[PDB]
Structure formats: C-alpha cells, structure tokens
Design a protein around this ligand. Sequence first.
Ligand SMILES: CC(=O)N[C@@H]1[C@@H](O)[C@H](O[C@@H]2O[C@H](CO)[C@@H](O)[C@H](O)[C@H]2NC(C)=O)[C@@H](CO)O[C@H]1O
Length: 366
Amino acid sequence: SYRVVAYYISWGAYGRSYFPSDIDYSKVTHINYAFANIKDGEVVVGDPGVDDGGKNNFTALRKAKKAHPHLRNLISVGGWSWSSGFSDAAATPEARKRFADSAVAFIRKYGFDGVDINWEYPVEGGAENMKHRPEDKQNYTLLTRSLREALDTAGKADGKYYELTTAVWGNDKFIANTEMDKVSRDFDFINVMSYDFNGTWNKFSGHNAPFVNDPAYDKPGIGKTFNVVSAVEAYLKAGVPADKLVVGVPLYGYSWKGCAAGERNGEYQDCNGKGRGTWEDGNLDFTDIEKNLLNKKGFKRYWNDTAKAAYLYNAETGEFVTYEDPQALKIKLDYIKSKGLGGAMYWEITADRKQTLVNLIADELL
Ligand SMILES: CC(=O)N[C@@H]1[C@@H](O)[C@H](O[C@@H]2O[C@H](CO)[C@@H](O)[C@H](O)[C@H]2NC(C)=O)[C@@H](CO)O[C@H]1O
C-alpha cells in the first residue's frame, strides 16, 4: 500500500564497503541509485569504477531484481553536485528529446525500472557550480513531459512500465519556482526531501528535520516553514496529490563544536563550526551516533516536545548532534498514514547498518 524509497549511494562501494548485496530488499519497495551525471545534455554513468565497471553495483542490482521480482530500481539523475546540466537539457525540445532518449537508453542498458529527476534546484539554490535561468519554472514541466512520453513509448515497445519520479526541496521556494500542480500528473510519485532544514552552513545549531515549527527557534533567516509538516502541507496546497507525496527522512546527523550551552543544552546556540563526523567532519552516520554517542562518552540525549526532535549535547566540547530519533520517526510514520501520503523516502541506506530506523519504517508501512 505505502512506498518505501531507499537512496543507495554509488560511493558506498569504496570506504563504506556497503554494496547492493548488503541491502535488505524485503525492507523497501524502491531503490533510487545516486547518481547518474549529465554530460553534453545526456544522462551518463556517474562512476565507471563502481557503476558499470569495477565493483559492478549495476550487476548486483539486477541480481537483486531476479531475487525480488516486486522490487523497482530507479536511476537518480543529478544530486547536489551534478545538477548544473539540467538548465540546458530543459530549455529546448531538441535538448529535451536528446535528454529523455539518453535516459531511456541508460535504463534499458543497465536494467533499471525508471528515472528519478534530482534537480537541485530550478530557478535558484544549489551548489557553487550550479546553473539557472528563470524559464526553469516552465522548463521543469516541459522536461518532465518529454521523459513521461519517451518512458511510456519505450515502455510499450519493451513490455514494461518505466516509473518517473522526482526529489523536491524542503524549502517552499521550490514551489514558487515550479508548477507542481501541472508536473504532479506526469510523476508516478514525488520524493519530498523533508530534511536539510538546518546544517553547518549555519554558525548556530538547529534540527535537520523538526516535525513542526518551534517558535523558540528564531536565529537569523530561518523560516517558520523549515519543518516536515509545513513542507508536506505546502506540497498538498501546491497540488501534489497525497497518495503521490513520499516523505523524506535522514539516516545521517549533523554536528557542530563549541556550542554555548545557554538554557537549552546547546539547542539554537552559537557554535565554533563543525563537530565530529563519520566520513567527513560535521556529518555522522546514525550507526556512528547509535554505537559511539547516543547517551555515551559525554553526549546526552535531549527531547524538544514542541518540534518533536531529539539532539545530543556534550557539555565538555559543546558538541551538538541533530539526528533522526526513533521517537520522532514514529510521529512521522503516524502522520504519513493519517494524511494518506505515498510512503517514506530516506537518504541514505548505508548510514544505518543496524537497520534501527530502516526496520521501523518497513515494520510500519509494509
Ligand atoms: C531550508 C533550506 O533550504 N536549507 C538549505 C539546504 O537544503 C541546503 O543543503 C542541501 O540540501 C539538499 C537537499 O535539498 C542536499 O541534496 C544537499 O546535499 C545539501 N547540501 C549540503 C552542502 O549538505 C543548504 C546548502 O548550503 O542550504 C540550506 O539553506
């Protein structure tokens, strides 16, 4: 009934040493492979060393399909760092044909069941390398159309339905910059990234995915709609049908160091930059939190009963971790069911080796 949409990261097959063979396929409905890049207006292999060569993640995904006929694997075109190719691809029917045809070619060659458009983001926002024009607002609708048509035609040729999905911003600027009411008709479902609301881009600490607005959080330029319920509600009002709205969830945490304690054990306080991380500073796998920090080694867990968010604080180093606690994830899973939504999505599956969050979502939606 409900979808469970796991992002798998290609670079999992390096240091992390977590491959598609390590996935518990019984615990999901979709795998979105992060990522395919864009080169010359064409969807291309992101990493020949682990995608279609070397560790051969694509082979391993096809082996998984055979074992689990019900499974659907999708290729996620773009991501934070590889979105700069979208503006061009979208802006002419010629370039849109070129793109959509390349995307059909990609999924037939590597045995994928469809495409996830991860464009970050139309009109404005994204990485230092990212490209925009204002016509992205309409062009996003146009590109979606070409893809829908090419996937539908190629689907009919191959005796196969090819899904089309997208990942959309938690910031409602995304909605003012697209036609979600138009483009919602062409997507099988929509992956709402209802996380990255607060991070080390801020000098002060906050929650990565608070459930509702905390008015006690008033640090400069953070919107009262930077929460999970505001974003879902903004996407229902913008025209995303409930049953197509998939709720994003993070399996990583963010950390700062040197956060003043104030009267909130570190919450919404000025800090001294990035805290400890797993694979890089200030970004923690839930596995790392669970095993090494969760009420351990000077880190204590606090609960905000306005936001419905947990955080750790180390009073000694003034380190503050925002992470997805089971207590908050359960409130989000009840919300999904009560609002009639499309299911849960999460970034990303290698970050929870014990499957503590992964099992709670599977057990609640499947
Ligand atoms: C509320 C808001 O708009 N926050 C912005 C963040 O979304 C953004 O972080 C980026 O979020 C993306 C999902 O929307 C991720 O794909 C991406 O990895 C992430 N970027 C980083 C560096 O982690 C940040 C970027 O600075 O800006 C916020 O204002």
